[PDB]
Amino acid sequence: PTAAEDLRHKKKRLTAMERVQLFCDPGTFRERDALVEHECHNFGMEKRKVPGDGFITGTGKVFGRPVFLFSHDFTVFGGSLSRTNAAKVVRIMEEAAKIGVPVIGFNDSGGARIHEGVDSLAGYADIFLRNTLFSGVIPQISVIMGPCAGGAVYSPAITDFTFMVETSSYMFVTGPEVVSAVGGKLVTKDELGGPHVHATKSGVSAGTFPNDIVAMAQLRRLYSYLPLSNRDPVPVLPTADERYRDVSSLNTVVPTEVKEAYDMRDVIYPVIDHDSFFEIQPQFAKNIICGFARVEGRSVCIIANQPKVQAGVLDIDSSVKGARMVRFADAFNIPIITFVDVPGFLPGVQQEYGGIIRHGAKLLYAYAEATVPKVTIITRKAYGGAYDVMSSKHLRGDSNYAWPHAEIAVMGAAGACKLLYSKETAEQQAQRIADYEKTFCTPLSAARKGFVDAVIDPSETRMRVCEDLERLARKQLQNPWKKHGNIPL
Amino acid sequence: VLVANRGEIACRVMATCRRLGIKTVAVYSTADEQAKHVKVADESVCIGPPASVESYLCIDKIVDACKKTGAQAVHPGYGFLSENGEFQSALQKNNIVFVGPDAHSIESMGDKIESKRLAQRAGVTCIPGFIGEVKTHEDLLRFAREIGYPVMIKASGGGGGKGMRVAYNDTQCVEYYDMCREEAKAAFHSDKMLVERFIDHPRHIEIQVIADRRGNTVYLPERECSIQRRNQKVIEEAPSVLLDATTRKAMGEEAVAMARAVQYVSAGTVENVVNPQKQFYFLEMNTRLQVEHPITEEITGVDLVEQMLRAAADLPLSITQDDITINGHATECRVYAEDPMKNYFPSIGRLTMYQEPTGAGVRCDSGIIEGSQISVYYDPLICKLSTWGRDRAECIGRMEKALDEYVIRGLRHNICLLRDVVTEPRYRSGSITTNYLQEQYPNGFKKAELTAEEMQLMYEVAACVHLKRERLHYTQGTAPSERQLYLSVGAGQEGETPVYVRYLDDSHFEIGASKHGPFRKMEVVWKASYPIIRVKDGEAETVLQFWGTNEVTYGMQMRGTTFDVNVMSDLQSTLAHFVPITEATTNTKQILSPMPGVIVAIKVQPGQMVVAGEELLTLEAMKMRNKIHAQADGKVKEVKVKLGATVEDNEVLVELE
Numbered sequence A: 001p002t003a004a005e006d007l008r009h010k011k012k013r014l015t016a017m018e019r020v021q022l023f024c025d026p027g028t029f030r031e032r033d034a035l036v037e038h039e040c041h042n043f044g045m046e047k048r049k050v051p052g053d054g055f056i057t058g059t060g061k062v063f064g065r066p067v068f069l070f071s072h073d074f075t076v077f078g079g080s081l082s083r084t085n086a087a088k089v090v091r092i093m094e095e096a097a098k099i100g101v102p103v104i105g106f107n108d109s110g111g112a113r114i115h116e117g118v119d120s121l122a123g124y125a126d127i128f129l130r131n132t133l134f135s136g137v138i139p140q141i142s143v144i145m146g147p148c149a150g151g152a153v154y155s156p157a158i159t160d161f162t163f164m165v166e167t168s169s170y171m172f173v174t175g176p177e178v179v180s181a182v183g184g185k186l187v188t189k190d191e192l193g194g195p196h197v198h199a200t201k202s203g204v205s206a207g208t209f210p211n212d213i214v215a216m217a218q219l220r221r222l223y224s225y226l227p228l229s230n231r232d233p234v235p236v237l238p239t240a241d242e243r244y245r246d247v248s249s250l251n252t253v254v255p256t257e258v259k260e261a262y263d264m265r266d267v268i269y270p271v272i273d274h275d276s277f278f279e280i281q282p283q284f285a286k287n288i289i290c291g292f293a294r295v296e297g298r299s300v301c302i303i304a305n306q307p308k309v310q311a312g313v314l315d316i317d318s319s320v321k322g323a324r325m326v327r328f329a330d331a332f333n334i335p336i337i338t339f340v341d342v343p344g345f346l347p348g349v350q351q352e353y354g355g356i357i358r359h360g361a362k363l364l365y366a367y368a369e370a371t372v373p374k375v376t377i378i379t380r381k382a383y384g385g386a387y388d389v390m391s392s393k394h395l396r397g398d399s400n401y402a403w404p405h406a407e408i409a410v411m412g413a414a415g416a417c418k419l420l421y422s423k424e425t426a427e428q429q430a431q432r433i434a435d436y437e438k439t440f441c442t443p444l445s446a447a448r449k450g451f452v453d454a455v456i457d458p459s460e461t462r463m464r465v466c467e468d469l470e471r472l473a474r475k476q477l478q479n480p481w482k483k484h485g486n487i488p489l
Numbered sequence B: 001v002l003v004a005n006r007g008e009i010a011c012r013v014m015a016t017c018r019r020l021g022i023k024t025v026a027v028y029s030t031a032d033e034q035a036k037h038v039k040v041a042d043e044s045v046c047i048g049p050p051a052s053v054e055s056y057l058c059i060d061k062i063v064d065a066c067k068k069t070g071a072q073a074v075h076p077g078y079g080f081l082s083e084n085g086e087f088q089s090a091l092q093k094n095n096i097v098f099v100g101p102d103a104h105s106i107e108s109m110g111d112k113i114e115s116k117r118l119a120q121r122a123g124v125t126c127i128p129g130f131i132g133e134v135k136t137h138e139d140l141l142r143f144a145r146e147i148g149y150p151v152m153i154k155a156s157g158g159g160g161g162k163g164m165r166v167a168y169n170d171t172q173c174v175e176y177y178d179m180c181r182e183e184a185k186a187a188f189h190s191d192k193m194l195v196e197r198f199i200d201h202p203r204h205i206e207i208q209v210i211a212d213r214r215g216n217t218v219y220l221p222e223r224e225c226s227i228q229r230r231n232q233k234v235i236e237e238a239p240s241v242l243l244d245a246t247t248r249k250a251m252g253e254e255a256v257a258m259a260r261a262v263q264y265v266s267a268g269t270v271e272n273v274v275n276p277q278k279q280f281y282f283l284e285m286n287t288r289l290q291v292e293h294p295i296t297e298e299i300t301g302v303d304l305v306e307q308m309l310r311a312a313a314d315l316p317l318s319i320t321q322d323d324i325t326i327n328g329h330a331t332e333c334r335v336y337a338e339d340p341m342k343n344y345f346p347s348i349g350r351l352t353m354y355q356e357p358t359g360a361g362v363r364c365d366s367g368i369i370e371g372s373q374i375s376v377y378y379d380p381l382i383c384k385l386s387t388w389g390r391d392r393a394e395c396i397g398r399m400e401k402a403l404d405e406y407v408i409r410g411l412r413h414n415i416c417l418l419r420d421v422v423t424e425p426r427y428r429s430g431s432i433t434t435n436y437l438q439e440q441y442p443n444g445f446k447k448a449e450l451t452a453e454e455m456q457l458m459y460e461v462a463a464c465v466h467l468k469r470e471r472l473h474y475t476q477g478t479a480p481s482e483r484q485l486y487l488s489v490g491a492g493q494e495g496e497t498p499v500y501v502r503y504l505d506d507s508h509f510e511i512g513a514s515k516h517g518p519f520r521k522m523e524v525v526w527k528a529s530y531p532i533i534r535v536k537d538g539e540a541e542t543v544l545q546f547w548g549t550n551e552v553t554y555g556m557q558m559r560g561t562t563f564d565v566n567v568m569s570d571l572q573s574t575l576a577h578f579v580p581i582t583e584a585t586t587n588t589k590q591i592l593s594p595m596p597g598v599i600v601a602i603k604v605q606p607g608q609m610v611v612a613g614e615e616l617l618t619l620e621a622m623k624m625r626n627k628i629h630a631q632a633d634g635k636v637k638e639v640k641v642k643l644g645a646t647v648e649d650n651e652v653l654v655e656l657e
Ligand SMILES: O=CCCCC[C@@H]1SC[C@@H]2NC(=O)N[C@@H]21
Pocket: A313, A343, A344, A345, A346, A347, A412, A414, B622, B623
């Protein structure tokens, strides 16, 4: 019996129920509500009632841990929401708020249902309010499998992570018809809101998958990292890997020349456990890396610069990416580990015309507000305000480390030499820049002041990180009483 | 003593001293501050920039540096400027030991010419043939019949293989002489031809020699260097199959006789060419310390390093030809960073992501430790894998097994070629030739495929690994123990093979066709997220490797080759048919610079060949030199952006057409 799904598969596409079956465990899905009708009675809609009413909501179970989910249905009315569709979603989110369980939704709606009038707006508003209230209480993940237009786009935005499917998905606020009507330009749906556009240009989508099957397979892996609720502790899984594994290849990663580049992944991979990195937003703002990883069987958060791309310089997009990652990680009590290599901020008129001052402050706010244990490692250099922003010791950092060839200075040697000698005799470059770099572009001064705990061999990083992260397991820090902060938007 | 090399041999020397209780010193270049031989040494001194000239080749630095160690002797090594006069002269200026042969023998034998003179000095069965011009076809036929050889027609003034044709009969002799005279008159202005005993099919047998400054000269057992690519050898073996004492004893005696002839001290080695009729040809003799001796040392125990350093002090050896014997045979291979399947593309500048050497009853000499890199201006050799044995089958099987346990990550290599060559039944037949490689690899290189049972075993191991890694993620006792998987390699699911699994213990399963099917109870032992995977069904034993996965596709290595097996359940299998398979853009067009900057260095030339992975140029921006390369293409047609063109802004630096 394979009835009524032949029409769907013929278009090389899967069904909502099949997606739900693929996500959860083999036999642990219990559909909650299945016999519900729209009761519209307008515009010749009194007929063609549907039992499911276009939504599939249940409970399920992943890796032995509970979950909640819902999936849109494209065959029935195009997946449009109504006064009645939104009730099921509201009930699921409320139940997942009472119990410490997350929510995952597979969006496929074609837009609002016009035949209901303003009831669709009512349902949208209720879903928006539930998302707003419960953000930071239970993790929310959203996946977009098909078209997603109109005002329905906003609820995925408030969710913590949004993923996209490559061939047959798109998302935008207004359709290309209106764009043609007002501006006069003919742009296709994919050219407007395709997965690539949101992966590279707008920065909304947190990832892209080639197929639905791969999407489910990796969504399970992502779910294996998250904590169940706000009050539950960070999960710890058994692992045969051990902190005594030898990592001596880190002694040679940093080149002896100051103008040559290297890949920061060569430093990230040895420290964490084998094959346990899940990069977030891999194709957007490549000069910074963010993602999840495990250290001795417990999930941690990774944020590191990359001198491979644009000399590892902070920017607007990198600031937004890092700020969102830090805020999410702190909201759910996940340790943060950072690797620092920054020469400063990206210079340019477009930057000031785009508001670098606002955006660069977001990362600093996220780092200063955080109360989870932090570990910082300075590999090569840290200059100016970039050193302050990237989790400096003064921002209530727990432990800070440096490598023997690091440099921590106010600015580059040339600018310091220029400002320290206004009209000093010519040729001052040769006998002053070298001396200043020798005397003050070294971690000795910063260690004398007390800004780094110790200068360590690069081969001891795994040992130190495991020791510190084990000791810091029970830190309790609290901020002054506030209704909420006022972050620079 | 101080060494002069920076490869595996240097480590070997600083290792022989262990027993010899000899403190050692090792110099290095700037790039090699993290080489193993630096830390293995007792003392280290820098020799300037790592370019070859200043590095080690800078005699002045080296000889000058030889004034602080106190060492009364200094090894000459085997590479770089080893056994050199300009160097021997300098070391005898400061009156220090050379730990090597004497000058007169070295210049008398390593010289390109007059080697034939020493050869014919006592004849020593040197190249045979009519020594003179053949002015008539009658003379050519008569001298061909004299020895009935394949003629070996070669020009008197020609060299390098030009003007040579192989004649098997008299008519072939006449026709090939007619072609040879026409070729040589145009190419080398000489019509003078010579006829010599051509070899049916060569084996390039090599005979080892050792000696001493006092006496007790000994002949070491011979070796093999038949396999050769681009005049570089790959696989070696000391006791070749075509070994008769009638020849071999005379080979050793004649090698020793030639030794005292030029009063050679530190013998290099003797070269020969051998036909199925058991001949020998002493010429192309070597005067350098060949490092293929590990094989001989495995069949003898004759520590060449110890004996030569002992002879460097004017003492006789500790061994005589009377006790030298054979305890089996050994196989040795060389591991290159040369990517064979990709047109022998060189892969350099890649530190070892992570590597582990095979150490099961085998020997490995290498200078590349974990976290080490290979520059372009050096030898791309990785390791020198040699395994002891007594029987061909025994020694080979060992190599087979030892090849699969060599984990190399971070750069390519030629291990697949070595594996395929060893596994070939032609190689295990017993005899080979010097044209063996290109004879068995006509068009490029193509690795041999898998039989049905091997692919089935790979499927079974993949299913076991999938289940073992799956059980890790589950919490407490809420974990499964049995599934039914559908494995199919390839993007089109070629050969869907249903598989079961039961996981009766930690490292035991009950693999079968499906439910209610007979079970076999194999065994797999693998640490999560690690490379090596040991699996043993009954007696058979296999070792596979685990590269990575994306939870639907598994990257597993079988017989030194990468595959991507798909492990999916019933639902995933039945649904993967209804999935779009888009084709990525195949654009052969101009390449643009991603970001603004300055071009300071260029690598490729305008309108010539380009291959994948080749660096093209280097922009420098905000104090940082990048290096955009050629992802993949055959050639280009474009106009180069000149040096110092601070324009960029996503311009067309190179255009591919
Ligand atoms: O010396 C002149 C340019 C130096 C720029 C150094 C890097 S580029 C971006 C960042 N901003 C700075 O002030 N320094 C760094």
